[PDB]
Enzyme design. Structure first.
Site, PDB file in Angstrom:
ATOM      1  N   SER A  95     -24.945  58.531   0.897  1.00 30.86           N
ATOM      2  CA  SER A  95     -25.747  58.591   2.112  1.00 30.86           C
ATOM      3  C   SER A  95     -26.881  57.577   2.077  1.00 30.86           C
ATOM      4  O   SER A  95     -27.281  57.047   3.118  1.00 30.86           O
ATOM      5  CB  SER A  95     -26.297  60.002   2.301  1.00 30.86           C
ATOM      6  N   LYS A 108     -23.857  62.661 -11.775  1.00 32.11           N
ATOM      7  CA  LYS A 108     -22.735  62.130 -11.025  1.00 32.11           C
ATOM      8  C   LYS A 108     -21.962  61.074 -11.793  1.00 32.11           C
ATOM      9  O   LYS A 108     -20.806  60.806 -11.458  1.00 32.11           O
ATOM     10  CB  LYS A 108     -23.236  61.544  -9.714  1.00 32.11           C
ATOM     11  CG  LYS A 108     -23.796  62.578  -8.770  1.00 32.11           C
ATOM     12  CD  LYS A 108     -24.627  61.947  -7.688  1.00 32.11           C
ATOM     13  CE  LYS A 108     -25.149  62.978  -6.725  1.00 32.11           C
ATOM     14  NZ  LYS A 108     -26.505  62.640  -6.239  1.00 32.11           N
ATOM     15  N   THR A 125     -26.653  61.411  -1.224  1.00 29.79           N
ATOM     16  CA  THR A 125     -26.713  60.861  -2.600  1.00 29.79           C
ATOM     17  C   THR A 125     -26.628  59.353  -2.549  1.00 29.79           C
ATOM     18  O   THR A 125     -26.281  58.780  -1.522  1.00 29.79           O
ATOM     19  CB  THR A 125     -25.587  61.420  -3.486  1.00 29.79           C
ATOM     20  OG1 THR A 125     -25.584  60.739  -4.743  1.00 29.79           O
ATOM     21  CG2 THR A 125     -24.227  61.263  -2.827  1.00 29.79           C
ATOM     22  N   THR A 126     -26.980  58.717  -3.657  1.00 26.29           N
ATOM     23  CA  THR A 126     -26.933  57.272  -3.777  1.00 26.29           C
ATOM     24  C   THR A 126     -26.324  56.926  -5.120  1.00 26.29           C
ATOM     25  O   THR A 126     -26.797  57.396  -6.158  1.00 26.29           O
ATOM     26  CB  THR A 126     -28.321  56.661  -3.661  1.00 26.29           C
ATOM     27  OG1 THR A 126     -28.970  57.167  -2.493  1.00 26.29           O
ATOM     28  CG2 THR A 126     -28.224  55.173  -3.536  1.00 26.29           C
TER      29      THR A 126
END
EC number: 3.4.25.1
Lengths: 202, 204, 222, 213, 197, 123, 214, 200, 202, 196
Positions: free
Chosen positions: A130, A33, A1-2
């Site tokens: 990530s 998120k 994820t970012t």
């Protein structure tokens, strides 16, 4: 994820992708998120979804109780400190990386980064997940002091798109938020709305 | 396979106003037999029976704990337990030990005391109830007796056909696995009476 | 196992198969993988069957308390939060993967719950071994604001795809339809596969089996 | 890390009679919990009087049937005659044992007519131990299938019943029924059922549907 | 390593044990007593890991004699067997598992003689004859051959000597002498120790 | 290695090398062997005692095993090679089949060896 | 390749009336990183045959040069004989099995499709030497995701047309782009028929993402 | 499995069960563990049935070759030595093998127990397999060199029977064999069920 | 380490850091990771320095022999294919990530990337090493078709500077090479010559 | 394990060995012989892993007898000991290492009696007395106590019997009978087997 956050004068911008993966299979392609801990305080979530949801709910509980008993709006430093003690006390069990952003009158727009291990660092711009690896350079180059709301939103969208195209774990639709004294403006960029960058195309 | 340490096999079948339950007799260590008179079927009521296979110590412990709870239930309520109720009790008992489980897979069989309606069930290692209308199994030769019962079993069988069916199934199954056998006992339950018969089986 | 759920216009449709396997041999051919939490909330379970059953029973109990104490129907977020807090407390050891669905005052809400305590509110979810095939069917043919018949056919097609392409799943399709006003629990909604008729009769006559002992005990009745 | 073996499922059966040999198998192929195809017969024709079935790792099955066809051709070229079923079996035992320390993870069954004209069935372990039988099952559901055949064909654990010799019709109906039951209660089998019977006239192949997963 | 044997009969139980206590290569003792009496008419034979044996046996002995003093009547062999089985089964899950292989023997005035068997997993069983140790594998086939439920005690001692001499000829370990004692209505009776020079 | 057909057929079908080898044997020291019912005997004719030689070294009677003995004629060196190979074979035969050799076995080995040298390349 | 380094994700394939079509995303992934975004994981073996591979792309390149030299030699002979797709399928199966038996496996999973003698061929090969034919195929997570759609469609309709097959393939590729993380929007379609192999350029899946606003 | 062999005055007796198992699954109850290597000596299986059968068949071809070359039938000691030297090359490579080579020769009755470990030992009694331990007791208590042939048959049957009764991985049917100076013979193939009817 | 190459009209540009680390220790802070395989062909080395030097020398040997045999200048595809064959034959033994670059008459400037595992792909721009992760986004964003030699040099320098700042294994000085018809012009950037991007400050 | 013992004297060397051959828990054989006769005047006692003992011993046997047949005179015991030490040491680093604990005894007309020792690692040591197996731990002390360099063969036999009865009483394993034989100028002599 970012996940990504940037501080502008009088507020902050939060951006995150919508992909959560179990291995190479995308269980949810539209997950959110960005989480409201409070009306003006938000949380982005990286790592174990369970850990992040749990600590988010607990922090929301504690911070609501603290804010209501104080009868004043809470502080982003306070929320980040709560996340810090939780993640540090349970650093062994929790694989969670958090970035907290909000607005409060005393200090204004604030961004704090709580990586794995339970340390707390205030930052002008802070990325996690990530995919933050792939865009450290882009943010280092592109950032400039004094950016505005729309400028920071475009910056965040470009960064997240660049991370999403490269990282398999990151992907989906970009979810954005901008927090200030006025309130929260959330928007979702999908498809052509997402910025596109040309491939090598030899 | 900790379950294969003692071996054993238990089976139940349904019929018209009748149930049959059967189990092998061998008590043995992983390859050494000790006794051919082991009790794997325990009576939990007038016309309700439970059958346990797996680790023999857990078989005995579970039967004792279950009789404890059951006698307390029958004394407090003043009635005989229903089979579904016993199933639920057994599931709770096994799930109480979900970490460090009792290594046994029960089988319950009986008639509802009021309506005399057949009931059979099986529970997993940790208490997953599994009600069926035809048959249930537990043991090492489960894979064998599943197909054997799938073939032989027919609906609304009378007690005679039920006995011949369950007997043929158990014999032809346990003959084909090593750690089970040494005879087999068949309890037949119906409204009026209980019938128990031991079968002639290969003691090899 | 293949469980699936979807939100239609005015409620929720849940669907599941009935095949319970111990290892790679079928144990139960007509299992009920659809559980009762509340009159307006239902759940389907996959993973460790005992964990799913006992967890659903526990939350059904707690919600019965909550509902009759409040005097109003229970909400879905309550169940989701109970479940996720429990599962997080046990840190994934209880392997209950759940899809949870219900209709309340705010509207139809459908949740997918994972063993480690994660949750996701979705319009359509699938869990279990045939989850990928069911997701394929949904990503292909799902549209927002479907009618009830269309949603039922979609979920049936999805569960059927999981059946005819996964070894674990099979034997039947179960449906549950929750709405603001009704609940239609359809246990044999479809029978895609049936056992073929036995060509040969192998019924054994009396005396086929030998006996070394017999003991008859009469049961007194009154 | 790298595992050279994987269980591709499969089930095979073989029955013998006074003047016939029946060999049958499922057609499903599956790695893990996923089906690969629903039409892959495990039963191959080696010669006019012989049929072989193979179950387990499909790659080993393929190489094995290839090797057997090759060595049958070689035998014919050398000795100017076709191989008998027992000779095929012995050669197969040597082949399987050659790679004892990296075995073919395959359970095979030979089914054919012997020189005398009787039915014959040879049942192999993966490592090459072979035993003649009147009937045998192989694969995932062998445990399910063998008891019923021991009861019906072999008349084991049956008291005061006529030891009738088996007939073609009864055998065909029986194999159909047992594969139906195994499809009911086994996941690896169930796509279809190819019945390749060998007799004096030749080999006939019949097919009957089974319940899809 | 250690060897136990039990032979039930019509009116008596016969039990035997090796008298060897060995730590390692060396044999420390040649007159070890593996038989514990819980009451006048029941015996407990215990073998297995060191310490667990005597600890568990003495615990059961304490509980049984306590029952006697409290209630005025001794436990039956069946009750004693289920009691020791419970105590052993509770512990295998616990942090203090007793790895002991047992063989119980008793006579009840009403129910007659009895012999019980339980392994370290605490799986109980009532048998006409039973044995423990690696020697059991050799000697059980002897009993299955020459045993009858109507066996007289002289014949039982003879059968025992057959089993033990087979052990001496065929078993790698050195079990020179064996303790012997009989349980009956009169009480426990010690016999001449079976020795092989 | 050296590979060439030293022994080959001639017109009229004779192995000239083998004939020449037998000719060389005829040149060698005479030997005689006779069989008796409980005794077997070998004798060899010393070409010249020479009064300085140690008789022990030049003995043409040799013992392949305890129960076997041989004599030779022709080339002493080749005889010695053959003797040593016979000795190792009789010992290996004891090793493999747990019994002493027979004379048929050992002379079969020796004849096979000599044949192999008649047919092999470079020998 | 004991451990793969740069991998390609699922390859699809389905046979229709008069030909075969296969599809693959143009991606080579280095452990969750879309490192190489423009690579052809589809090969043109001959006029009647095309090949598509998943797994280690280097092993696929090795197979490319080997098989290319093979068909080149077959052309050099000029004997009027050409390798059939099933022949290449057999050869490849033996190669993968041999490399497996030496415990030096080629980590690829291949899909051979071809049309010859008025018959359409479609076969699978695994790194372990597993091989089979089917009307439709999928590798990787495609086996779990797409193959259900193809199987349902083919079961209800045994034989398809070129356009129907193409629409089906694009639909499955959309599904894979949705629910697979080692996938990319760009993908090539290769179709074989009486005319021959025709490989199309990069194509888009045209996602919707309407779900997010809920 | 279980096997049995002993020497007495009127030759050698060989007995074995007929059960084959993979884990807890009885694949076969009619397997011939005893192998007729040739008309004059025979062998048994324990351990890997494939291993035993293959290596004993190899021994058979070697024995026939020896017979043809030497014009005298091979001795039992030599045969056992061949087998041991062959399997010893594959020591530690996973072979599970155990067998009893039985025959007559110039010396007399021959019985040798070969093993994959490498042991080669002659004797008058041997038992191999999971049930060997149960067999040894009955055989030792009932064995004498001065023994009638029928008594030998009976004690072999009873030994195998009790071994089957106690051991799970042995059963089926005894396959009794008798080696005499002329050659071996199969005397009986009684089933343990019939034997249970008999002995009880 | 960090290596980078980009193709411009009529040639290529190569760039690489100058640091080799054994653990957290910098054995050589001025190493030259650009190895000339030939007069007009260059190689940038990542991974095991031993493996890369060995394969580089062997390929240099083979390629010089091939070139002198043919009496024509070698091709970059040929060099890359040699590297590929070696690294694929010995993929289990050696860990080497290569990016070959050069100019030839018939095809002009060419860049090939031979990562670990022995695959080969031509690329308009390619990066490798531990630091390449941190600049994937920057290169995906700011790359433009038809860049000049000076533009590509500045691009490469900026990218390597970002990677050097963020990555510990890469650092030191930047070595640059521009290859074309005329020849190779190598330059080294040290100190202020490195492009400096301002670190965020509060 | 298997037990060996050696007792050198002025004009003789005495050796003994247990006669049992074993399986997992069962005494398969009671009359096994662990003594190998390399020549008329020397012996080789080998214990260890199964098969290695027999293979190695019989290899040394045929090599020694081959020396005799070729050369007309038998090897000295020290020479045979160094020979087998070489054959064993060469193999411990090879793919096929023997695991054999040996005890070698011989008489030489010139050198006199000799007793040699070597473990599975091929470390040679001449000694007046020696032993192998777990029983050696028990019995070597008795030899150290009651041994003298000048000891008659009768007293040596009695000492051996002391050692063996100590084993019978104090050692877990059952070694009921022991083979005995003695080597001197006349040759190898088998004696009455000690038994209990």
């Amino acid at each position: 994820t970012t996940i990504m956050a940037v501080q502008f004068d009088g507020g902050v911008v939060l951006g995150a992708d919508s992909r959560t993966t179990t291995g190479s299979y995308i269980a949810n392609r539209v997950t959110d998120k960005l989480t409201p801990i409070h009306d003006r305080i938000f949380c982005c979530r990286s790592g174990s979804a369970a850990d992040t949801q749990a600590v988010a709910d607990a922090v929301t509980y504690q911070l609501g109780f603290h804010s209501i008993e104080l009868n004043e709006p809470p502080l982003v430093h306070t929320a980040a400190s709560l996340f810090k003690e939780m993640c540090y006390r349970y650093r062994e069990d929790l694989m969670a990386g958090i970035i907290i952003a909000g607005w409060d009158p005393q200090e204004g727009g604030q961004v704090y980064s709580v990586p794995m291990g339970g340390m707390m660092v205030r930052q002008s711009f802070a990325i996690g997940g990530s995919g933050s690896s792939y865009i450290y350079g882009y943010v280092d180059a592109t950032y400039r002091e004094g950016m505005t709301k729309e400028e920071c939103l475009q910056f965040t969208a470009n960064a997240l798109a660049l991370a999403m195209e490269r990282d398999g774990s990151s992907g989906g639709v970009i979810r954005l938020a901008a927090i200030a004294e006025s309130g929260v403006e959330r928007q979702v960029l999908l498809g052509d709305q997402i910025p596109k960058f040309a491939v090598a195309t030899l | 396979s900790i379950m294969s340490y003692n071996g054993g096999a238990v089976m139940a079948m349904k019929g018209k106003n009748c149930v049959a339950i059967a189990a092998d007799r061998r008590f043995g260590i992983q390859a050494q037999m000790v006794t051919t008179d082991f009790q794997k079927i325990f009576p939990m009521g007038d016309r309700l029976y439970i059958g346990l296979a797996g680790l023999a110590t857990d078989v005995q412990t579970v039967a004792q704990r279950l009789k404890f709870r059951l006698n307390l239930y029958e004394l407090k309520e003043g009635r005989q337990i229903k089979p579904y109720t016993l199933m639920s009790m057994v599931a709770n008992l096994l799930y109480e030990k979900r970490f460090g489980p009792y290594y046994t897979e029960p089988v319950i069989a009986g008639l509802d005391p009021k309506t005399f309606k057949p009931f059979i069930c099986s529970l997993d290692l940790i208490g997953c109830p599994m009600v069926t209308d035809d048959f249930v199994v537990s043991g090492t030769c489960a894979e064998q007796m599943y197909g054997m019962c799938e073939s032989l079993w027919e609906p609304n069988m009378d007690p005679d056909h039920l006995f011949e069916t369950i007997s043929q199934a158990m014999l032809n199954a346990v003959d084909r696995d090593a750690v089970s056998g040494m005879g087999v006992i068949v309890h037949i339950i119906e409204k009026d009476k209980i019938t128990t018969r031991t079968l002639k089986a290969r003691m090899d | 196992t293949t469980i699936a759920g979807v939100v239609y216009k005015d409620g929720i449709v849940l669907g599941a198969d009935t095949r319970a396997t111990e290892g790679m041999v079928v144990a139960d051919k007509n299992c009920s993988k659809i559980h009762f939490i509340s009159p307006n909330i239902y759940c389907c379970g996959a993973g460790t069957a005992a964990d799913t059953d006992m967890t659903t029973q526990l939350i059904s109990s707690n919600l019965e308390l909550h509902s009759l104490s409040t005097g109003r129907l229970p909400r879905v977020v309550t169940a989701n939060r109970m479940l996720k807090q429990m599962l997080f407390r046990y840190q994934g050891y209880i392997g209950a993967a759940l899809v949870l669905g219900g209709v309340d005052v705010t509207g139809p809400h459908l949740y997918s719950i994972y063993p480690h305590g994660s949750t996701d509110k979705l319009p359509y979810v699938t869990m279990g071994s045939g989850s990928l095939a069911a997701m394929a069917v949904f990503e292909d043919k799902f549209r927002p604001d479907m009618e009830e018949e269309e949603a039922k056919n979609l979920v049936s097609e999805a569960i059927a795809a999981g059946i005819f392409n996964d070894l674990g799943s099979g034997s039947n399709i179960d449906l549950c339809v929750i709405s603001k006003n009704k609940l239609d629990f359809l246990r044999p909604y479809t029978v895609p596969n049936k056992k073929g008729t036995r060509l040969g009769r192998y019924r054994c006559e009396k005396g086929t089996t030998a006996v070394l002992t017999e003991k008859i005990t009469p049961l007194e009745i009154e | 890390r790298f595992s050279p073996y994987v269980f591709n499922g499969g089930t095979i059966l073989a029955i013998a009679g006074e003047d016939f040999a029946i060999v049958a198998s499922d057609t499903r192929l599956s790695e893990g919990f996923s089906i690969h195809t629903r039409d892959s017969p495990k039963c191959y024709k080696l010669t006019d009087k012989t049929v072989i079935g193979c179950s387990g790792f499909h790659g080993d099955c393929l190489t094995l049937t290839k090797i057997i066809e090759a060595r049958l051709k070689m035998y014919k070229h050398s000795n100017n005659k076709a191989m008998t079923t027992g000779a095929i079996a012995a050669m197969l035992s040597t082949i399987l044992y050659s790679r004892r320390f990296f075995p073919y993870y395959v359970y095979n069954i030979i089914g054919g007519l012997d020189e005398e004209g009787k039915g014959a069935v040879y049942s192999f372990d993966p490592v090459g131990s072979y035993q003649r039988d009147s009937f045998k099952a192989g694969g995932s559901a062998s445990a399910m299938l063998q008891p019923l055949l021991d009861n019906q064909v072999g008349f084991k654990n049956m008291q005061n019943v006529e030891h009738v010799p088996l007939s073609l019709d009864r055998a065909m109906r029986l194999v159909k029924d047992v594969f139906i039951s195994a499809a009911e209660r086994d996941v690896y089998t169930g796509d279809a059922l190819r019945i390749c019977i060998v007799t004096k006239e030749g080999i006939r192949e019949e097919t009957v549907s089974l319940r899809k997963d | 390593m250690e060897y136990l044997i039990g032979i039930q009969g019509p009116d008596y139980v016969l039990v035997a044990s090796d008298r060897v206590a060995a730590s390692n290569i060396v044999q420390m003792k040649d007159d070890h007593d593996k038989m514990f009496k819980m009451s006048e008419k029941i015996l407990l034979l215990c073998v297995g890991e060191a310490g667990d044996t005597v600890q568990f046996a003495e615990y059961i002995q304490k509980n049984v004699q306590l029952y006697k003093m409290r209630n005025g009547y001794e436990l039956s062999p069946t009750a004693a067997a289920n009691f020791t089985r419970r105590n052993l089964a509770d512990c295998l899950r616990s942090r203090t598992p007793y790895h002991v292989n047992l063989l119980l023997a008793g006579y009840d005035e009403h129910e007659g003689p009895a012999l019980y068997y339980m392994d370290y997993l605490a799986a109980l069983a009532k048998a006409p004859f039973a044995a423990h140790g690696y020697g059991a594998f050799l000697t059980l086939s002897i009993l299955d051959r020459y045993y009858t439920p109507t066996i007289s005690r002289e014949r039982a001692v003879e059968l025992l000597r057959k089993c033990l001499e087979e052990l001496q000829k065929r078993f790698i370990l050195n079990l020179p002498t064996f303790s012997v004692r009989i349980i009956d209505k009169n009480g426990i009776h010690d016999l001449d120790n079976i020795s092989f020079p | 290695s050296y590979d060439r057909a030293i022994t080959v057929f001639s017109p009229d079908g004779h192995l000239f090398q083998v004939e020449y080898a037998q000719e060389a044997v005829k040149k060698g020291s005479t030997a005689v062997g006779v069989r008796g019912r409980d005794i077997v005997v070998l004798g060899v004719e010393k070409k010249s005692v020479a009064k300085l030689q140690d008789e022990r070294t030049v003995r043409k009677i040799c013992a392949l095993d305890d129960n076997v003995c041989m004599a030779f004629a022709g080339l002493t060196a080749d005889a010695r090679i053959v003797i040593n190979r016979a000795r190792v074979e009789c010992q290996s035969h004891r090793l493999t089949v747990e019994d002493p050799v027979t004379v048929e076995y050992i002379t079969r080995y020796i004849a096979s060896l000599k044949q192999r040298y008649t047919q092999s390349n470079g020998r | 390749t004991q451990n793969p380094m740069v991998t390609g994700t699922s390859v699809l394939g389905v046979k229709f009336e008069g030909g075969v079509v296969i599809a693959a995303d143009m991606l080579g992934s280095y452990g969750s990183l879309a490192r190489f975004r423009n690579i052809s994981r589809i090969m043109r073996v001959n006029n009647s045959t095309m090949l598509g591979a998943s797994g280690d792309y280097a092993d696929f390149q090795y197979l490319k040069q080997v098989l290319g030299q093979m068909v080149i030699d077959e052309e050099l002979l000029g004997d009027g004989h050409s390798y059939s797709p099933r022949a290449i399928h057999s050869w490849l199966t033996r190669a993968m099995y041999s490399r497996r038996s030496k415990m030096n496996p080629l980590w690829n999973t291949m899909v051979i499709g071809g049309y010859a003698d008025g018959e359409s061929f479609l076969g699978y090969v695994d790194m372990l030497g597993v091989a089979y034919e089917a009307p439709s195929l999928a590798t990787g997570y495609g086996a779990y995701l797409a193959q259900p759609l193809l199987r349902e469609v083919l079961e209800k309709q045994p034989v398809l047309s070129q356009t129907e097959a193409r629409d089906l393939v694009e639909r499955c590729m959309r599904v894979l782009y949705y629910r697979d993380a080692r996938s990319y929007n760009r993908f090539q379609i290769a179709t074989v028929t009486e005319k021959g192999v025709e490989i199309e350029g990069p194509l888009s899946t045209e996602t919707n993402w309407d779900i997010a606003h809920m | 499995t279980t096997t049995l062999a002993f020497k007495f005055r009127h030759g050698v007796i060989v007995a074995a069960d007929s059960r084959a198992t993979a884990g807890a699954y009885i694949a076969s109850q009619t397997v011939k563990k005893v192998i007729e290597i040739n008309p004059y000596l025979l062998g048994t299986m324990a351990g890997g049935a494939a291993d035993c059968s293959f290596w004993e068949r190899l021994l058979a071809r070697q024995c026939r070759i020896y017979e043809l070359r030497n014009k005298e039938r091979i001795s039992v000691a030599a045969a056992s030595k061949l087998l041991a030297n062959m399997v010893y090359q594959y020591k530690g490579m996973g072979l599970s093998m155990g067998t009893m080579i039985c025959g007559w020769d110039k010396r007399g009755p021959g019985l040798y127990y070969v093993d994959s470990e490498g042991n080669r030992i002659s004797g008058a009694t041997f038992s191999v397999g999971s049930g060997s331990v149960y067999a040894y007791g009955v055989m030792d208590r009932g064995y004498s060199y001065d023994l009638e042939v029928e008594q030998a048959y009976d004690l072999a049957r009873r030994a195998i029977y009790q071994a089957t009764y106690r051991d799970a991985y042995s059963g089926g049917a005894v396959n009794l064999y008798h080696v005499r100076e002329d050659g071996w013979i199969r005397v009986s193939s009684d089933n343990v069920a019939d034997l249970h009817e008999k002995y009880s």
